[PDB]
Amino acid sequence: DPTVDLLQSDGSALPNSVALTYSPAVNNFEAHTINTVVHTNDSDKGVVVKLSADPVLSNVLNPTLQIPVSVNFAGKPLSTTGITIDSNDLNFASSGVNKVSSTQKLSIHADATRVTGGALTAGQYQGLVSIILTKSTDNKQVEKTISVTASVDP
């Protein structure tokens, strides 16, 4: 049983899969935004949020061909270095014996203007976004895995 969790704003589990939408006019992907809430067993503590790895989407036929992914949470960019979101900025409301934050935006941003390992090729790209959350001052990690897919039009 985790001390903290990240759920959708309706109380459902975070999606474990996201398919991004391509926009041919700009040769890039739309941002994908998920409305979320933080659950905690201590409303005096904040949360530390990071990625377990730099997320990238690899072309399924040539995984050397890679599209970098950016992830923002609560209006802050995430990286492999943890950031702390103070309890005051989460606006925790009492839900039974535990506490739930106001709605926080989680956004996934594949940037096809910065493809590496070759040029922008049509077809399918895949990668994982792996988000790690801990309560401030605690070490117990909760990991959210999101399998991301994205097709470039051609």
Structure in words:
This protein is mainly beta and 154 residues long. The chain has one domain: CFA/I fimbrial subunit E, pilin domain (Immunoglobulin-like, Sandwich). 3% of the residues lie in helices and 53% in strands. The chain contains one helix and 15 strands; from the N terminus they run ββββββββββαβββββ. Strands 1, 2, 5, 6, 7, 8, 9, 10, 11, 12, 13, 14 and 15 form a 13-stranded mixed beta sheet that branches. The chain has a two-stranded antiparallel sheet with strand order 3-4. β3 and β4 form a beta hairpin. The longest helix is centred in the middle third of the chain and has 4 residues. The chain is elongated, with a radius of gyration of 17 Å. It is classed as cell adhesion. Keywords: CS1 pilus, colonization factor, pilin, chaperone-usher family, bacterial surface, cell adhesion. The assembly is monomeric. Structure of the CooA pilin subunit from enterotoxigenic Escherichia coli. The protein is CS1 fimbrial subunit A.
Strand content: over 45%
Count of DSSP helices?
1
Broad structural category: mainly beta
CATH superfamily: CFA/I fimbrial subunit E, pilin domain
Helical content stands at: under 10%
CATH class (first level) name: Mainly Beta
End-to-end C-alpha gap = 46 Å
Number of structurally distinct domains: 1
CATH architecture label name: Sandwich
Task: Considering the chains and any ligands shown, give keywords for the structure.
1 helix; elongated; CS1 pilus; mainly beta; two-stranded antiparallel ribbon; cell adhesion; about 150 residues; Immunoglobulin-like
